[PDB]
Amino acid sequence: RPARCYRYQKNKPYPKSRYNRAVPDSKIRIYDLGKKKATVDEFPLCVHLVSNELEQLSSEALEAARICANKYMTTVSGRDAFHLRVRVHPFHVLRINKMLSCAGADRLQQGMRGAWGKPHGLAARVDIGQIIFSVRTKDSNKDVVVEGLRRARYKFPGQQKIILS
Amino acid sequence: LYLRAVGGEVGASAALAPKIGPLGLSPKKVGEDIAKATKEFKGIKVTVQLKIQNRQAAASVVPSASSLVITALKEPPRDRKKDKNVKHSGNIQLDEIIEIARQMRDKSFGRTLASVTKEILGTAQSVGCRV
Amino acid sequence: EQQIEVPEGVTVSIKSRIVKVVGPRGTLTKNLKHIDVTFTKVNNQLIKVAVHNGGRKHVAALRTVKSLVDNMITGVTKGYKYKMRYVYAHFPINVNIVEKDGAKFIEVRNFLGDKKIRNVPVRDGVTIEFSTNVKDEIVLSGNSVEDVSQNAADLQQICRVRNKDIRKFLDGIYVSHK
RNA sequence: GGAUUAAGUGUAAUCCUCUGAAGGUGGUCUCGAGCCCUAGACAGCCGGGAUGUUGGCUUAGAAGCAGCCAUCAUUUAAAGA
Incomplete structure (x- = not known):
């Protein structure tokens, strides 16, 4: 924190586990919520979660913003309705100033060449319109799930659109 | 014991409380309970035969589930055809099913209040009385 | 624009945007000047006036004026x-x-x-x-x-x-x- | 010619340089969507908010309105256990 020089893509690939080790584990609980198995897809009421932005939310971003989300999805009696889906994973690894590579801004260090930033965190990135994490059930209430994501958004760097079913 | 209480009359000490009160019955529950059902028929003297168990729990009457449902419905007849005819017969409050189940309970051997209500509901279903 | 005529029992007579009221209860005056507005004149009956103007701006006014009068009328007779x-x-x-x-x-x-x-x-x-x-x-x-x-x-x-x-x-x- | 804005917003192409991101306004104008209306709407506006009965259970209480069950009947112009 804060996430600033973290989620703007001004770099290019990898993740690559070959290349990198010492990746921190994600603190993003399972990306399968609600009752799985049965096809939730048969449902009235629909979806949400549209990013409306560019990218790279960190696992710190998604994992408390998503279960936060689920927490107020609990209202629908624990195990009784909806499945929650998350889309993208936090693959993508980021490195931060370890003074040896270059100079100035991050992904630059001291000297020239040298320490790339040391591994510290991972974040998935997204596009202008992608569905961050969706799923629904019949209109349980007015739309508790719609209330969900109200809270879900408001912990994402992006401005997420609710998007109607 | 038994006493004749006016339809919508309750807790008063002189009439009600000391008679039963010393029996172990809890007046408060009875006054509200009796008065509750007794609301549909007010101004009518309903003699109550309160029965109190060691539990000090109790029930009272108007004798049979069908009869009780009939009265609760306030209709004398059962539907000619229970499944098809319903609203025509009549309806009873869910709470009233509870009321009957509770009064009947000494007679019934349901494990729980829910079970007893289900038992009474079964009778109501036959009568064409909807809940 | 609008025209208000009333009442008998109470006179008017406004000059140079002062305005007035009459009686029998005491009279009240109110300047009522704002923007190119007529500052209503008595028209040998009752006062009511409009100025060639635009939309809302003057309109918020010459509405208010109407209410100031008509409550000057009743504030002069039966206070x-x-x-x-x-x-x-x-x-x-x-x-x-x-x-x-x-x-x-x-x-x-x-x-x-x-x-x-x-x-x-x-x-x-x-x-x-x-x-x-x-x-x-x-x-x-x-x-x-x-x-x-x-x-x-x-x-x-x-x-x-x-x-x-x-x-x-x-x-x-x-x-x-x- | 036409329309919006009431904040002096703004009168700032680009940028170290011109900030502003995830305070308020039934001032006014313009555009869209839902529902309700001449079987008469809003005000829509004005006035009123029945008996068994505090329904049964539960509970310290549980009286239309924590919860479970039932949701009948009466008197009605009408009024849900």
Whole structure:
């Protein structure tokens, strides 16, 4: 924190586990919520979660913003309705100033060449319109799930659109 | 014991409380309970035969589930055809099913209040009385 | 634009945007000048005037003017009075009016029952009647409703206190009547 | 010619340089969507908010309105256990 020089893509690939080790584990609980198995897809009421932005939310971003989300999805009696889906994973690894590579801004260090930033965190990135994490059930209430994501958004760097079913 | 209480009359000490009160019955529950059902028929003297168990729990009457449902419905007849005819017969409050189940309970051997209500509901279903 | 004609019993006669009213109750004047507006003239009947103007801006005006008049009409014949009671917690309040709003003039004493009297002001031509009994009613009246208004008010508000909370104490005098 | 804005917003192409991101306004104009209306709407506005009965259970209480069950009947112009 804060996430600033973290989620703007001004770099290019990898993740690559070959290349990198010492990746921190994600603190993003399972990306399968609600009752799985049965096809939730048969449902009235629909979806949400549209990013409306560019990218790279960190696992710190998604994992408390998503279960936060689920927490107020609990209202629908624990195990009784909806499945929650998350889309993208936090693959993508980021490195931060370890003074040896270059100079100035991050992904630059001291000297020239040298320490790339040391591994510290991972974040998935997204596009202008992608569905961050969706799923629904019949209109349980007015739309508790719609209330969900109200809270879900408001912990994402992006401005997420609710998007109607 | 038994006493004749006016339809919508309750807790008063002189009439009600000391008679039963010393029996172990809890007046408060009875006054509200009796008065509750007794609301549909007010101004009518309903003699109550309160029965109190060691539990000090109790029930009272108007004798049979069908009869009780009939009265609760306030209709004398059962539907000619229970499944098809319903609203025509009549309806009873869910709470009233509870009321009957509770009064009947000494007679019934349901494990729980829910079970007893289900038992009474079964009778109501036959009568064409909807809940 | 609009035209208001009324009433008989009360005259008009405005010159150079001063405006007037007549009687039998006393007359009120109101400048009513704002933006290219006619500043309504009496048209050998009743006054009502419009200026070639645009949309909302003048329109918010020459609406307001209409309301200022028509409440100048009724403020000249059958005046305007606001009326309401005083009363609260232990010990009564002393409301009384001596000439003028000035300190130690316009009423109120023991608010709860405090020392030092706090009250002002009175408007230009308003009359403060007093309670029917020891104290339990006030009548405020006057030709203009714009002096009589914040006389009864500004006499209610002169009870308002920002301290404990209104809930605990409910002293004061309020003009519930309109 | 036309329309919006009431904040002096703004009168700032680009940028170390011109900030502003995830305070308020029934001032006014313009555009869209839902529902309700001449079987008469809003005000829509004005006024009113029945008996068994505090329904049964539960509970310290549980009286239309924590919860479970039932949701009948009466008197009605009408009024849900």
